[PDB]
Amino acid sequence: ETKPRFNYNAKYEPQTGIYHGAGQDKNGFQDYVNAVGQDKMPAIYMTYVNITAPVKRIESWGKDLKHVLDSLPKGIMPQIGLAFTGGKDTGAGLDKEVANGKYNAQLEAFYKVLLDLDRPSFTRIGYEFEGDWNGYSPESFKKVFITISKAFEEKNIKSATVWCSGGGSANFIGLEKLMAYYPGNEYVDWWGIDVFSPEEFSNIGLKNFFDTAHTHKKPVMIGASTPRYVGVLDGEISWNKWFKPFFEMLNDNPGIKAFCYINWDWEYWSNKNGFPWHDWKDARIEKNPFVLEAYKTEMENPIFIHL
Numbered sequence: 001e002t003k004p005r006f007n008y009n010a011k012y013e014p015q016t017g018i019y020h021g022a023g024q025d026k027n028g029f030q031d032y033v034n035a036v037g038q039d040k041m042p043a044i045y046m047t048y049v050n051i052t053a054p055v056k057r058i059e060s061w062g063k064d065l066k067h068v069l070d071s072l073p074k075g076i077m078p079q080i081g082l083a084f085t086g087g088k089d090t091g092a093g094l095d096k097e098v099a100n101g102k103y104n105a106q107l108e109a110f111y112k113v114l115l116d117l118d119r120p121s122f123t124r125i126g127y128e129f130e131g132d133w134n135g136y137s138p139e140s141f142k143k144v145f146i147t148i149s150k151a152f153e154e155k156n157i158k159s160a161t162v163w164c165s166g167g168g169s170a171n172f173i174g175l176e177k178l179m180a181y182y183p184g185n186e187y188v189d190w191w192g193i194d195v196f197s198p199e200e201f202s203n204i205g206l207k208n209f210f211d212t213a214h215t216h217k218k219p220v221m222i223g224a225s226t227p228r229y230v231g232v233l234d235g236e237i238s239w240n241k242w243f244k245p246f247f248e249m250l251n252d253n254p255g256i257k258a259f260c261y262i263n264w265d266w267e268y269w270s271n272k273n274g275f276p277w278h279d280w281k282d283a284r285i286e287k288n289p290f291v292l293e294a295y296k297t298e299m300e301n302p303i304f305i306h307l
Protein backbone atom coordinates (compact mmCIF):
# COMPACT_ATOMS: atom_id res chain seq x y z
CA GLU A 1 0.00 0.00 0.00
CA THR A 2 3.08 2.27 -0.30
CA LYS A 3 2.68 3.92 -3.71
CA PRO A 4 5.82 3.69 -5.89
CA ARG A 5 7.60 7.04 -5.87
CA PHE A 6 7.69 9.49 -8.73
CA ASN A 7 11.20 10.51 -9.81
CA TYR A 8 11.95 14.11 -10.83
CA ASN A 9 15.75 13.66 -11.07
CA ALA A 10 16.40 16.53 -8.68
CA LYS A 11 19.70 17.08 -6.89
CA TYR A 12 20.23 14.31 -4.29
CA GLU A 13 16.75 12.93 -4.99
CA PRO A 14 16.72 9.14 -4.55
CA GLN A 15 15.44 7.16 -7.50
CA THR A 16 12.96 4.91 -5.69
CA GLY A 17 12.62 5.43 -1.92
CA ILE A 18 12.05 7.98 0.85
CA TYR A 19 14.97 9.39 2.83
CA HIS A 20 14.66 8.74 6.57
CA GLY A 21 15.44 11.89 8.56
CA ALA A 22 15.33 12.85 12.22
CA GLY A 23 16.27 15.62 14.59
CA GLN A 24 16.82 18.01 15.90
CA ASP A 25 19.61 17.97 18.50
CA LYS A 26 22.59 15.65 18.87
CA ASN A 27 21.42 13.71 21.92
CA GLY A 28 17.76 13.54 20.85
CA PHE A 29 18.90 12.11 17.52
CA GLN A 30 21.02 9.47 19.28
CA ASP A 31 18.16 8.56 21.63
CA TYR A 32 15.88 8.16 18.61
CA VAL A 33 18.41 6.00 16.78
CA ASN A 34 18.84 3.80 19.84
CA ALA A 35 15.05 3.37 19.96
CA VAL A 36 14.49 2.55 16.29
CA GLY A 37 17.66 0.48 15.87
CA GLN A 38 21.18 1.19 14.64
CA ASP A 39 20.34 -0.59 11.37
CA LYS A 40 17.64 2.10 10.82
CA MET A 41 20.01 5.05 11.19
CA PRO A 42 18.57 8.10 9.36
CA ALA A 43 20.15 9.26 6.13
CA ILE A 44 19.31 12.84 7.18
CA TYR A 45 20.27 14.81 10.32
CA MET A 46 18.45 18.09 11.06
CA THR A 47 20.32 21.26 12.07
CA TYR A 48 19.65 25.00 12.14
CA VAL A 49 21.53 28.27 11.79
CA ASN A 50 20.42 31.91 11.71
CA ILE A 51 22.38 33.91 9.15
CA THR A 52 21.84 37.13 11.08
CA ALA A 53 23.77 35.81 14.09
CA PRO A 54 27.39 36.98 14.50
CA VAL A 55 29.95 35.50 12.12
CA LYS A 56 31.50 33.63 15.07
CA ARG A 57 28.18 31.90 15.80
CA ILE A 58 28.10 30.75 12.17
CA GLU A 59 31.64 29.43 12.54
CA SER A 60 30.93 27.67 15.84
CA TRP A 61 27.73 26.20 14.39
CA GLY A 62 29.75 24.84 11.49
CA LYS A 63 32.46 23.41 13.72
CA ASP A 64 29.98 21.69 16.03
CA LEU A 65 28.06 20.29 13.05
CA LYS A 66 31.20 18.71 11.61
CA HIS A 67 32.05 17.32 15.06
CA VAL A 68 28.61 15.73 15.34
CA LEU A 69 28.61 14.35 11.80
CA ASP A 70 32.09 12.85 12.04
CA SER A 71 31.08 11.02 15.23
CA LEU A 72 28.17 9.47 13.29
CA PRO A 73 28.53 6.89 10.50
CA LYS A 74 29.79 8.13 7.15
CA GLY A 75 27.28 9.49 4.62
CA ILE A 76 24.74 11.30 6.80
CA MET A 77 23.28 14.31 5.00
CA PRO A 78 22.78 17.46 7.08
CA GLN A 79 19.41 19.11 6.52
CA ILE A 80 19.91 22.76 7.46
CA GLY A 81 17.13 25.10 8.51
CA LEU A 82 18.54 28.49 7.47
CA ALA A 83 16.77 31.42 9.12
CA PHE A 84 17.16 35.19 8.85
CA THR A 85 14.94 36.38 11.70
CA GLY A 86 15.58 39.09 14.26
CA GLY A 87 13.56 37.53 17.07
CA LYS A 88 12.17 34.25 18.36
CA ASP A 89 8.86 33.90 16.46
CA THR A 90 8.19 37.63 16.80
CA GLY A 91 7.64 38.36 13.11
CA ALA A 92 11.04 40.10 12.91
CA GLY A 93 11.93 39.24 9.33
CA LEU A 94 15.40 40.39 8.33
CA ASP A 95 15.13 39.34 4.67
CA LYS A 96 15.27 42.96 3.45
CA GLU A 97 18.55 43.46 5.31
CA VAL A 98 19.96 40.20 3.90
CA ALA A 99 18.76 41.15 0.41
CA ASN A 100 20.68 44.44 0.75
CA GLY A 101 24.00 42.81 1.65
CA LYS A 102 24.08 43.70 5.35
CA TYR A 103 24.81 40.04 6.25
CA ASN A 104 27.15 39.08 3.39
CA ALA A 105 29.91 38.33 5.90
CA GLN A 106 27.72 35.71 7.55
CA LEU A 107 26.75 34.27 4.16
CA GLU A 108 30.43 33.88 3.29
CA ALA A 109 30.96 32.08 6.59
CA PHE A 110 27.99 29.86 5.72
CA TYR A 111 29.32 29.07 2.24
CA LYS A 112 32.72 28.25 3.74
CA VAL A 113 31.18 25.75 6.18
CA LEU A 114 29.33 23.92 3.39
CA LEU A 115 32.48 23.89 1.26
CA ASP A 116 34.50 22.48 4.16
CA LEU A 117 31.80 19.90 4.90
CA ASP A 118 32.22 18.79 1.24
CA ARG A 119 29.32 16.33 1.34
CA PRO A 120 25.72 16.13 0.08
CA SER A 121 23.32 18.24 2.14
CA PHE A 122 20.06 20.18 2.01
CA THR A 123 19.48 23.83 2.86
CA ARG A 124 15.92 24.97 3.61
CA ILE A 125 16.50 28.65 2.83
CA GLY A 126 14.18 30.71 5.01
CA TYR A 127 12.17 27.67 6.04
CA GLU A 128 8.46 28.18 6.70
CA PHE A 129 8.80 31.26 4.52
CA GLU A 130 5.15 32.38 4.73
CA GLY A 131 4.69 31.95 8.51
CA ASP A 132 3.78 35.22 10.23
CA TRP A 133 6.13 34.33 13.10
CA ASN A 134 9.10 34.74 10.74
CA GLY A 135 7.80 37.94 9.13
CA TYR A 136 9.41 37.54 5.70
CA SER A 137 8.27 39.61 2.70
CA PRO A 138 7.77 37.94 -0.71
CA GLU A 139 9.98 40.10 -2.95
CA SER A 140 12.94 40.23 -0.58
CA PHE A 141 12.54 36.54 0.34
CA LYS A 142 12.82 35.58 -3.34
CA LYS A 143 15.85 37.79 -3.87
CA VAL A 144 17.57 36.17 -0.88
CA PHE A 145 16.68 32.66 -2.09
CA ILE A 146 17.96 33.35 -5.61
CA THR A 147 21.18 34.90 -4.29
CA ILE A 148 21.97 31.87 -2.13
CA SER A 149 20.90 29.42 -4.85
CA LYS A 150 23.20 31.15 -7.36
CA ALA A 151 26.06 31.18 -4.84
CA PHE A 152 25.65 27.42 -4.31
CA GLU A 153 25.78 26.90 -8.08
CA GLU A 154 28.71 29.25 -8.65
CA LYS A 155 30.79 27.71 -5.85
CA ASN A 156 29.73 24.15 -6.77
CA ILE A 157 28.48 23.75 -3.20
CA LYS A 158 27.22 20.24 -2.38
CA SER A 159 23.80 21.27 -1.09
CA ALA A 160 20.30 21.03 -2.57
CA THR A 161 18.03 24.05 -2.08
CA VAL A 162 14.66 23.42 -0.42
CA TRP A 163 11.70 25.84 -0.62
CA CYS A 164 9.85 24.79 2.51
CA SER A 165 6.32 25.92 3.34
CA GLY A 166 4.92 26.31 6.82
CA GLY A 167 1.80 24.51 5.63
CA GLY A 168 -1.02 24.23 8.15
CA SER A 169 0.86 26.22 10.78
CA ALA A 170 0.63 29.14 8.34
CA ASN A 171 -3.06 28.35 7.63
CA PHE A 172 -2.43 26.75 4.20
CA ILE A 173 -2.46 29.96 2.13
CA GLY A 174 -3.71 29.73 -1.45
CA LEU A 175 -1.40 28.89 -4.33
CA GLU A 176 -1.41 32.46 -5.66
CA LYS A 177 -0.18 33.67 -2.26
CA LEU A 178 2.39 30.86 -2.04
CA MET A 179 3.74 31.72 -5.49
CA ALA A 180 4.45 35.28 -4.34
CA TYR A 181 7.33 33.65 -2.41
CA TYR A 182 8.37 31.26 -5.20
CA PRO A 183 11.74 32.10 -6.82
CA GLY A 184 11.20 29.88 -9.86
CA ASN A 185 11.97 26.26 -10.71
CA GLU A 186 15.49 27.05 -11.92
CA TYR A 187 16.60 28.02 -8.38
CA VAL A 188 14.76 25.33 -6.38
CA ASP A 189 15.95 21.74 -6.07
CA TRP A 190 13.25 20.41 -3.72
CA TRP A 191 9.97 21.57 -2.29
CA GLY A 192 9.35 21.16 1.42
CA ILE A 193 6.42 21.31 3.81
CA ASP A 194 6.35 21.00 7.59
CA VAL A 195 3.53 18.98 9.14
CA PHE A 196 2.55 19.33 12.80
CA SER A 197 -1.08 19.49 13.96
CA PRO A 198 -3.03 16.27 13.25
CA GLU A 199 -5.89 18.12 11.50
CA GLU A 200 -3.41 19.11 8.78
CA PHE A 201 -3.49 15.57 7.36
CA SER A 202 -7.10 15.94 6.20
CA ASN A 203 -6.86 19.57 5.07
CA ILE A 204 -7.43 20.09 1.35
CA GLY A 205 -4.56 22.61 1.36
CA LEU A 206 -2.14 19.74 1.95
CA LYS A 207 -3.35 17.78 -1.10
CA ASN A 208 -3.31 20.99 -3.17
CA PHE A 209 0.29 21.56 -2.10
CA PHE A 210 1.37 18.09 -3.27
CA ASP A 211 -0.61 18.52 -6.51
CA THR A 212 1.26 21.69 -7.48
CA ALA A 213 4.65 20.41 -6.30
CA HIS A 214 4.20 17.53 -8.73
CA THR A 215 3.45 19.84 -11.67
CA HIS A 216 6.41 22.04 -10.77
CA LYS A 217 8.29 18.71 -11.21
CA LYS A 218 9.88 18.90 -7.76
CA PRO A 219 10.17 16.19 -5.10
CA VAL A 220 8.74 17.02 -1.67
CA MET A 221 10.58 16.76 1.63
CA ILE A 222 8.64 16.77 4.88
CA GLY A 223 11.12 19.33 6.22
CA ALA A 224 10.05 19.00 9.86
CA SER A 225 7.34 17.06 11.64
CA THR A 226 6.26 16.16 15.17
CA PRO A 227 2.95 15.02 16.77
CA ARG A 228 2.01 18.52 17.84
CA TYR A 229 -0.71 18.59 20.55
CA VAL A 230 -0.62 14.77 20.58
CA GLY A 231 2.78 13.55 21.69
CA VAL A 232 3.44 9.87 22.29
CA LEU A 233 2.49 9.24 25.92
CA ASP A 234 -1.05 7.94 25.24
CA GLY A 235 0.06 4.81 23.38
CA GLU A 236 -2.40 3.63 20.74
CA ILE A 237 -4.41 6.85 21.11
CA SER A 238 -1.31 8.89 20.26
CA TRP A 239 -0.47 6.57 17.36
CA ASN A 240 -3.93 6.65 15.78
CA LYS A 241 -4.29 10.44 16.15
CA TRP A 242 -1.01 11.46 14.49
CA PHE A 243 1.35 8.68 13.47
CA LYS A 244 -1.25 6.64 11.59
CA PRO A 245 -2.24 9.51 9.24
CA PHE A 246 1.42 10.58 9.05
CA PHE A 247 2.50 7.28 7.51
CA GLU A 248 -0.67 7.23 5.41
CA MET A 249 0.40 10.59 3.98
CA LEU A 250 3.85 9.21 3.09
CA ASN A 251 2.25 6.14 1.44
CA ASP A 252 -0.37 8.06 -0.54
CA ASN A 253 1.69 10.88 -2.10
CA PRO A 254 4.30 9.52 -4.54
CA GLY A 255 6.22 12.80 -4.77
CA ILE A 256 7.32 12.70 -1.12
CA LYS A 257 10.96 11.60 -1.21
CA ALA A 258 12.12 12.46 2.32
CA PHE A 259 10.74 12.98 5.82
CA CYS A 260 12.21 14.54 8.96
CA TYR A 261 10.78 13.51 12.36
CA ILE A 262 11.58 15.67 15.41
CA ASN A 263 12.13 13.51 18.51
CA TRP A 264 11.76 16.22 21.16
CA ASP A 265 10.36 16.95 24.62
CA TRP A 266 8.89 20.23 23.41
CA GLU A 267 8.20 21.60 26.89
CA TYR A 268 11.91 21.21 27.75
CA TRP A 269 13.08 22.92 24.56
CA SER A 270 10.48 25.70 24.84
CA ASN A 271 11.86 26.79 28.21
CA LYS A 272 15.45 26.18 27.15
CA ASN A 273 15.21 28.03 23.82
CA GLY A 274 12.49 30.59 24.57
CA PHE A 275 10.18 29.52 21.77
CA PRO A 276 6.41 29.00 22.17
CA TRP A 277 6.12 25.20 22.09
CA HIS A 278 5.13 24.63 25.73
CA ASP A 279 1.89 22.76 24.97
CA TRP A 280 3.17 20.79 21.94
CA LYS A 281 3.46 17.61 24.11
CA ASP A 282 6.28 15.05 24.39
CA ALA A 283 7.34 13.66 20.98
CA ARG A 284 10.17 11.33 22.13
CA ILE A 285 9.06 7.99 20.69
CA GLU A 286 11.30 6.10 23.13
CA LYS A 287 9.14 7.30 26.04
CA ASN A 288 6.19 5.09 25.00
CA PRO A 289 6.45 1.35 24.20
CA PHE A 290 3.44 1.23 21.90
CA VAL A 291 4.60 4.19 19.83
CA LEU A 292 8.23 3.08 19.75
CA GLU A 293 7.36 -0.43 18.54
CA ALA A 294 4.84 0.82 15.98
CA TYR A 295 7.31 3.40 14.66
CA LYS A 296 10.15 0.88 14.53
CA THR A 297 7.79 -1.33 12.50
CA GLU A 298 7.08 1.43 9.98
CA MET A 299 10.83 2.00 9.60
CA GLU A 300 11.12 -1.64 8.47
CA ASN A 301 9.14 -0.71 5.35
CA PRO A 302 11.62 -1.15 2.45
CA ILE A 303 10.55 2.20 0.94
CA PHE A 304 12.64 3.97 3.61
CA ILE A 305 16.31 4.71 2.92
CA HIS A 306 18.44 4.46 6.04
CA LEU A 307 22.19 4.92 6.64
Ligand SMILES: O[C@@H]1[C@@H](O)[C@H](O[C@@H]2[C@@H](O)[C@H](O[C@@H]3CO[C@@H](O)[C@H](O)[C@H]3O)OC[C@H]2O)OC[C@H]1O
Pocket: 048, 083, 089, 128, 133, 169, 194, 224, 262, 275, 276
Ligand atom coordinates in the same frame (compact mmCIF):
# COMPACT_ATOMS: atom_id res chain seq x y z
O1 LIG B 1 15.26 28.70 15.86
C1 LIG B 1 14.83 27.40 15.41
C2 LIG B 1 13.32 27.39 15.22
O2 LIG B 1 12.95 28.33 14.19
C3 LIG B 1 12.90 25.99 14.79
O3 LIG B 1 11.55 25.94 14.56
C4 LIG B 1 11.10 24.71 13.98
C5 LIG B 1 9.98 24.93 12.95
O4 LIG B 1 9.89 23.79 12.08
C6 LIG B 1 8.62 25.19 13.58
O5 LIG B 1 8.36 26.46 14.05
C7 LIG B 1 7.07 26.64 14.65
C8 LIG B 1 5.96 26.43 13.63
O6 LIG B 1 4.70 26.69 14.24
C9 LIG B 1 4.55 28.00 14.77
O7 LIG B 1 3.26 28.08 15.37
C10 LIG B 1 5.61 28.29 15.83
O8 LIG B 1 5.55 29.66 16.24
C11 LIG B 1 6.99 28.03 15.25
O9 LIG B 1 7.98 28.19 16.27
O10 LIG B 1 8.33 24.23 14.60
C12 LIG B 1 9.31 24.20 15.64
C13 LIG B 1 10.66 23.78 15.09
O11 LIG B 1 10.60 22.43 14.59
O12 LIG B 1 13.29 25.08 15.82
C14 LIG B 1 14.71 24.98 15.97
C15 LIG B 1 15.23 26.34 16.43
O13 LIG B 1 16.65 26.29 16.56
